[PDB]
Structure formats: structure tokens, C-alpha cells
Write a protein that binds this DNA or RNA. Structure first.
Ligand SMILES: Nc1nc2c(ncn2[C@@H]2O[C@H](COP(=O)(O)OP(=O)(O)OP(=O)(O)O)[C@@H](O)[C@H]2O)c(=O)[nH]1
Ligand SMILES: Nc1nc2c(ncn2[C@@H]2O[C@H](COP(=O)(O)OP(=O)(O)OP(=O)(O)O)[C@@H](O)[C@H]2O)c(=O)[nH]1
Ligand SMILES: Nc1ncnc2c1ncn2[C@@H]1O[C@H](COP(=O)(O)OP(=O)(O)OP(=O)(O)O)[C@@H](O)[C@H]1O
Ligand SMILES: Nc1ncnc2c1ncn2[C@@H]1O[C@H](COP(=O)(O)OP(=O)(O)OP(=O)(O)O)[C@@H](O)[C@H]1O
Ligand SMILES: [Mg+2]
Ligand SMILES: [Mg+2]
Ligand SMILES: [Zn+2]
Ligand SMILES: [Zn+2]
Lengths: 349, 347
DNA sequence: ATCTGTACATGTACAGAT
DNA sequence: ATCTGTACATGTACAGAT
DNA sequence: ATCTGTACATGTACAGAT
DNA sequence: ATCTGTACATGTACAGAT
């Protein structure tokens, strides 16, 4: 019971999955063909599906989809922004119209990308779909879809580089004692990605490891058979779902928590999965203890004001410059409260 | 243990590895380039290193290397040869036209041209002392005999590469689901399969690339034998068993029918029967070797050792190995087992 | 002038050597 | 314990080709 | 270059078994 | 209550064709 029943509630319905995906795939496919069918500065982008729905940890409803349109760009030089670790300027075609002083401007290229999508969305007459107003500094072009429910799709332009990952990641991805050195070496043989976030704030990109995280979510055990048809279930994803849910419920209720996001939870459980690598440490019979030790770890992160980017160890997602101490102390109070009272926020609608 | 000292004996020396590999890689590279010449039928053939040396289970000396020269052959149809599971006929200005006889790609015609080219190229090698061994009938290999002073064999194996789905005779093979798992199994079966020459148009399936992967990714835990994981004794047990057979085989001509692939197949089944890394703790080397010996003896006595990839192919069937050959090896193994392995002290 | 099969450049798991 | 040679995967440079 | 075909992973859904 | 077996559904890798 208890947490088992909560997970029963969070579980997506097969029918809703079917109806959401088919409408999502209609729009995405149409947008994707537009990007190459034309001259178009983004001819050659490929679709990369990412985030919780494609990692099978989406909760409640299939109402948010994350898609990367990635562009392979060769002979790119990276300059780390302000020792931040995650933010870079990039330098040396149709992309000529996006540079400046030899700097590929994230802002300029996102704007044309965005302009294309808006135009194509205008030609869609079979689906009720609009482009959400732009959020400054965001990497996303966000679609809002109606019909069987509200659905949002974040279309994320990404650059794809095939060289060695930037030195700031050298000490990241510390999976050696959990997924192992062969897996780590192979993952770092994959490309890395750059996403037009902006900390020259307008020209900066941010590193993305959404492809690495997806692999990890679907290949998460120390045993190769974890959660496979001839292995045993673990409760790793279910703990992620529960913690995601506690934060979503807390964020709905308290504006004091706007600065928090699900990626903070994702980052925290990557660290917990590294600290507790054995699959037996995530036995489904120990769901409550597992959820609790995740809570305690997350609270220790808040208390110490320290949650390092799992791929970029020096980039503290909980630094003062990013999240006010007051916000972190508010979230500590609310989590400790739910914890010490049987999670009442889990009962509510 | 006694067995740890045997393993020290069996361990290859780096100095020997260097000298052997340097010469082997010179000859192989030159043979691969000549294959890409002109109107050579084998142009586009690619190199695949296989077998015990590339699996790090070669014992005693680095004196036998296995290398496949693989040729992608698109658009092919296979006919299983008489329900044997492992043997096939292959059918379709193509450069393999000279090897056809009405739809059918002749194995020995292709192997013979392959061989002729190799022999010719070896004649032009004066860098080092290397000759081509007399052909063994029905063998897929062209064997090089290198004297580096020390003697080194190189089996060069012509291979057809097909990228379609594996033949149905393997549908139930590779039973690694409780051990390496379903994702690993699916991904391995997405790789190509291989046909090597074995009546004269018969080819044989090869899974040397899959076996190589398994050898180097052999644990249920991803960290098995890794620098942040725990050592197992799976490969060490393979080495000891290979050594038992090699010592016996160089002493007793009665054992000519047996080869090391029998030992490699038996321990794949053992690795399937005991998937947990803790059933191969280095502290239990003796038990682990002993249970392998016992499994092998039961295969001998019951006359049943299924091909790991082709379940219906029995490597210990009557048609391949006489019951007396099996009973002879059984006695010799049982003898070594119950007398402290005196053949391990030999030489 | 650009294109490209061939081979160099880089990085590291494995396992022998010290 | 760290150091180190071979094998091998992938990214890239460029003589020689087009 | 783009697209379908095949195979089976990952899921949800529910009845019958335990 | 949970487990197991079948049915149902989407996502994804890659072969082969055009
Ligand atoms: C895939 N999607 C991404 C990535 N980064 C951002 N997104 C999408 O873009 C949305 C907004 O990105 P955020 O990182 O939140 O950036 P922001 O909104 O400008 O800044 P915040 O206030 O931190 O939310 C995310 O919720 C994702 O849906 C990525 O690396 N891969
Ligand atoms: C790589 N090398 C192979 C393969 N098959 C055979 N070889 C090499 O070629 C040698 C001869 O193969 P065998 O199976 O012994 O052929 P054979 O001796 O004619 O037939 P048998 O009497 O059954 O031994 C082997 O010892 C290997 O070195 C293969 O599938 N992959
Ligand atoms: N600040 C960030 N830094 C790096 N990558 C991020 C960041 N925020 C999001 N991402 C990446 O983008 C993906 C999609 O983000 P999103 O906000 O939709 O979360 P999610 O993982 O899909 O979960 P959910 O949608 O269920 O809240 C994340 O899974 C992660 O890979
Ligand atoms: N009878 C066979 N059937 C199928 N594949 C075989 C057979 N014999 C050998 N092979 C394959 O060819 C490879 C090379 O064969 P080889 O006889 O050299 O043995 P090995 O595994 O390299 O060991 P060693 O050379 O130390 O005896 C094997 O590893 C196996 O994959
Ligand atoms: Mg999301
Ligand atoms: Mg060999
Ligand atoms: Zn699991
Ligand atoms: Zn091991």
C-alpha cells in the first residue's frame, strides 16, 4: 500500500499514451521535414527523443514531450564561458547568417529556428496547436496542443559535436563502480550537445547530456538483467517518480519554489544511484526505505547548498547565484513536513 | 593454490607478445592490402581478429593467432544443408561470378582462389621466414607458419559476412538471457553473421565475433574484472581446461577428434548454468574448475554437447566422435582429477 | 579547385611487469 | 600499488585522384 | 537522401494463480 | 494482497530498397 498506491495513481494510461503520441508525432514529423525540405539553415537536423516520457518516468499524464533537433557541425572551437563549466561560446554555409565576431550566436540561430517553426505551425489545420510565447534565455520552442488534453512539446535545437567532451566533464559521469569503465568510455565516445540557453549572454550555449541520461535510465542496474524479463525488478525508477511527484505537488502549491525543477530531482538520484550502486540496494520490497534515503540525500543537498551537475562536477546547481538560500530553506521545511507526516500532499488532487 | 601456480606457468610474457604480434601484424597487414588490389575478387575484405589470443585466454605462448578476412556479400539466400543447423548452401559483372555454378557459390572454389593469392603474396615476403602450411581437406583456413625463430601459426579464415537476421537454426541458441540479458542478446543478434568454408559448396556458420564479445563482457555485473569491480575466475577456469586438453592431446593421438572449441562451448553452458559472478569467485578456483570438469565429463559420457549458438548441432554426436574416443578422454580426465593433475607438471 | 580511401591521432580497457 | 605495451574504436588529415 | 520492414526493448491492462 | 501469462501499445536500431 501507501507508496504502491501513489505509484498506481501516477501510472500513465495506455489509451492516453496512444492518443498523445500520435498527435505529437504528427506535429514533430511535419516540423522535422520542414527543417531540411527547403534550403533552410538547419538542413540535416535529426530527431532525438529525450526526457521523462522517453525514459518511462513521466508521471500522471503524457502531457509534456522533449525533442531535440540536432545539427552536426564540424570544426567548432569551444571557449568556456566564465569558468561555469556548462556554458560555452562556439566559433569556426547557411549558418553564416548566425555568426558575429566569428561567434555562433545562440540567440540569432534560435530565432530563425523559432521563426521557421512558427510559420509551419501556421500551416497546420488538422490539429489545435500553437507556439507558446517565448521565455527569454530559454533553449526551447514550446508547442501547446489541445484535443484529448493539454500537451506541451519542447522542441530543442542542439548542436552536435563529435570531438572529445570538454575538459569540464573529465571528472563527471562517475559511474565506474556502478555501470563500469567500459560503459563510461563508450558513453564518452558518443557526441556531446550544445543547447541555446544563455547564461556575451546572448551568444552562449549550454551542454546537454540528454542522450547520456536516457541511456542511463534504460541501462541503470549494476546487473545487466535489472528490470529485464529474465531479471529482477528494482525500484530505482519508482523512487524517481515519487520524488518527481513530491516536487510537482509542492511546486503547484508554493510559488516560493519556482526556482526548482525536475532536473534537480533527476540530478540528485543520479548521485544516489552512484552512491548505492548495488541493485539489491533498490529492491522493490524496500521502496519506502529507498524513497526515504533519497529524501534525506536531497535534504542534505539543500542544507549544504550543493547539488553538482552529474556530468560537470564544478557546476553547482544549488549555488547561491542560482537559488536563494531562502528558497532552499523553504523547500527543506516543506519536505521535512511531508516526510514526518506520511506525505499528505500525496493524497490531494 | 596449486592452480594459481599453473596459471602463472600459462601466463604469456609481454616480451613474447611484442615480438609475435609485431611479425604477425606485418604479414597480416600485407596480405590484407594485396586482397584490395586490382580486379581481386576479395577487394573490400576486412580484418576481424578472433580466437583465444584476442580473448586473452591464449595459454603458454603466443604461437597461434586467428584472423578472419570477411567479405560482405549482399543479397544472398541460404539453404540449410540436410537439417544439420550449422551447414549451408549459398545462392543469389559480380566479382564472385568465377566461383558460381548455377546460383550456388562454391566454397572450395572461392577458398582455392583465396589460397592461391595468399601463397603468391607470401612468396614475395623476404622480411621474415613465413610459409603456407599444406592444406587440410575440408578446413576453412589458410595457415601461415612463421619462424620468428620461435614457431607461430596464423589461421587466416575467409568469411562471408551477411547482415540479415541470423538463420532460424540459431533462434534458440545464445541463451544468455538470465546472465548477460535480453538487451545484450538483442544487440548481439543485430550484428552480422559469418559463413566459413567447410560437399564442396558447403559453408559453416561462425560466431567468433559474438564469442569474442562474450569473453570480454562475461559477467552479470558490468564491473566484472574491471578496475572498479571484482575479479572473477571465469577466464582462469577456461585456461586451466584448455591446458588440460592441450597436454592430453599432445600425448595421446586417441584424442585427435577433440579440440579447444569443445572446451569453449562447455564453459559457455557452464557460464549460463551459473550466471552469478559470486559463483566464480577467485577464492573458489578449485571448485569452479572441478565443477567444469564434472560438467564436461557428463557431456562426454552422455554424448551431448550442444553448439552454444546452434542448439540442434551436437558436437559430441556419434557421427563426429566415436564413443570410445569419448570414454578414453573421460578416463584420462577422471584420472587427472583424482591424482592432483600430474599432467599439469609435465614438460 | 574539391574529393576521398587510407592511415594517423587520441584515449583507454586489459593484463603483464615492476 | 603504479607503470606500460597491445588491441581497438572513432575522429580526422591529406596525397593522390577526379 | 528518405522511407518502410523487422525485431524486441520498454511500457500498460487484466484474468487466473498463488 | 501479490505474481504470472497473455494481449496490447509505442519507441528505436538498423537492413535494405528506392
Ligand atoms: C532536452 N531538452 C532540454 C534541454 N535543456 C532544456 N530543455 C527543455 O527546455 C526547457 C526549459 O529549459 P531550462 O533549462 O528550464 O531553461 P530556462 O527556462 O531558460 O531556465 P530555468 O529558469 O532554469 O527553467 C526544459 O524544461 C526542457 O523541456 C536539454 O539539454 N535536452
Ligand atoms: C575463426 N576461425 C576459425 C573458424 N572456424 C575454423 N577456424 C580456424 O580454422 C581452424 C580449422 O577449423 P576446424 O573446425 O578445426 O576445421 P577442420 O580441422 O578441417 O575440421 P575438424 O575436423 O572438425 O577440426 C581452426 O582451428 C581455427 O583456427 C571460425 O569460425 N572463426
Ligand atoms: N538545467 C538543465 N541542464 C541540463 N539539462 C537539462 C536541464 N533541464 C533539463 N535538461 C534536460 O532536458 C530534459 C527535459 O527536461 P524537462 O524539464 O522536460 O524534464 P524531464 O526529465 O523530461 O521531466 P518532466 O518533464 O517529467 O518534469 C531533461 O530530462 C534533461 O536531460
Ligand atoms: N568446430 C568449430 N565450430 C565453430 N567455430 C569454431 C570451430 N573451431 C573453431 N571455431 C572458431 O574459431 C576460433 C579459432 O579456433 P582455434 O582452434 O584457434 O581456437 P581458439 O579459441 O583460438 O583457441 P586455441 O587457439 O588457444 O586453441 C574459435 O575461437 C571459434 O570461435
Ligand atoms: Mg519533460
Ligand atoms: Mg586459436
Ligand atoms: Zn532496474
Ligand atoms: Zn570477470
Amino acid at each position: 500500500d501507501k507508496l504502491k498506491k501513489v505509484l498506481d495513481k501516477l501510472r500513465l494510461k495506455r489509451k492516453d499514451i496512444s492518443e498523445a503520441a500520435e498527435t505529437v508525432n504528427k506535429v514533430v514529423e511535419r516540423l522535422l521535414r520542414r527543417m531540411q525540405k527547403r534550403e533552410s539553415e538547419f538542413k540535416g537536423v535529426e530527431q532525438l527523443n529525450t526526457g521523462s516520457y522517453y525514459e518511462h518516468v513521466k508521471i500522471s499524464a503524457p502531457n509534456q514531450f522533449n525533442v531535440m533537433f540536432k545539427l552536426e557541425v564540424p570544426r567548432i572551437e569551444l571557449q568556456e564561458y566564465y569558468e561555469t563549466g556548462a556554458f560555452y561560446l562556439v566559433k569556426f554555409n547557411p549558418l553564416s547568417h548566425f555568426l558575429e565576431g566569428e561567434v555562433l550566436s545562440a540567440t540569432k540561430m534560435l530565432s530563425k529556428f523559432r521563426k521557421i517553426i512558427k510559420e509551419e505551425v501556421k500551416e497546420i489545420k488538422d490539429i489545435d496547436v500553437s507556439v507558446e510565447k517565448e521565455k527569454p534565455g530559454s533553449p526551447a520552442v514550446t508547442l501547446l496542443i489541445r484535443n484529448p488534453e493539454e500537451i506541451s512539446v519542447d522542441i530543442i535545437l542542439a548542436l552536435e559535436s563529435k570531438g572529445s567532451w570538454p575538459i569540464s566533464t573529465k571528472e563527471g559521469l562517475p559511474i565506474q563502480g556502478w555501470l563500469g569503465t567500459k560503459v563510461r568510455t563508450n558513453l564518452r565516445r558518443e557526441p556531446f550537445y550544445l543547447v541555446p540557453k544563455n547564461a556575451f549572454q546572448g551568444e552562449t550555449w549550454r551542454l546537454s547530456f540528454s542522450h547520456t541520461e536516457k541511456y542511463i535510465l534504460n541501462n541503470h542496474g549494476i546487473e545487466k538483467t535489472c528490470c529485464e524479463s529474465s531479471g529482477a525488478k528494482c525500484c530505482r525508477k519508482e523512487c524517481l517518480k515519487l520524488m518527481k511527484y513530491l516536487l510537482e505537488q509542492l511546486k503547484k502549491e508554493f510559488q516560493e519554489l519556482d526556482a526548482f525543477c525536475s532536473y534537480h530531482v533527476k540530478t540528485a538520484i543520479f548521485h544516489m544511484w552512484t552512491q548505492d550502486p548495488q541493485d539489491s540496494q533498490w529492491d522493490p520490497r524496500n521502496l519506502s526505505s529507498c524513497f526515504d534515503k533519497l529524501l534525506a540525500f536531497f535534504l542534505e543537498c539543500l542544507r549544504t547548498e550543493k547539488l553538482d551537475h552529474y556530468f560537470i562536477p564544478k557546476f553547482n546547481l544549488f549555488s547561491q547565484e542560482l537559488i536563494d538560500r531562502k528558497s532552499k530553506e523553504f523547500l527543506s521545511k516543506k519536505i521535512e513536513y511531508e516526510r514526518n507526516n506520511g506525505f499528505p500532499i500525496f493524497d490531494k488532487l
